[PDB]
Amino acid sequence: KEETELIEGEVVEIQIDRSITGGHKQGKLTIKTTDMETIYELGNKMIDGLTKEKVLAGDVISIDKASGKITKLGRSFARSRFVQCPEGELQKRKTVVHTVSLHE
């Protein structure tokens, strides 16, 4: 049994800011659930991880901070695959039970 802290919500809006020379990248990400909404100040490796595997507005994603892997769950129900918006707290400590054989 192991526990891993996870972040999963719906992307509201993403700003990518470049300097004059483009050496330093600054960013802001707004992500919400059905119960809360927040804005995060992004670092450089978050910016490179979001530019790769392109994430737009209205996208439901799951972010692992300690490993840097971000997966797109789907798209939210916003006509303006289709997955519903997540609920509860944005930052959940979740316990996953692993079973591994002796041969592995």
């Binding site: 707004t30 659930t33 119960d35 809360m36 909404e37 927040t38 509860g88 707290e89």
Partner: protein, 125 residues
Amino acid sequence: ERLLFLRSVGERNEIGFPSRFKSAHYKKPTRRHKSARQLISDENKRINALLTKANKLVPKATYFSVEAPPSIRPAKKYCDVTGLKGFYKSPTNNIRYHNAEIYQLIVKPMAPGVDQEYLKLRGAN
């Protein structure tokens, strides 16, 4: 019996205008208000005047040099309501909060003008 008691302490500690303690020559000058904020401003005006006079030998000790420099390590973020660890910051009024219950109970239904006096404690207005 109560209102008469302070009169005794009054006549015990009275000092007349010909005061027994100060010297014979008074020459008491007029006094301005001279508020606390004003003193630092006239001080930096004075040392700026002296620095411009000396520039056209070099001082090192001023009132800027005694004041503690800002930190190099990053600061710790805290919740503006409970004082716990602040994980999230609201995008509308920039108030850090702990979890969803605090957000829905305080941060969302808040009256305006209270966010500035929230941010006044850490001076973020």
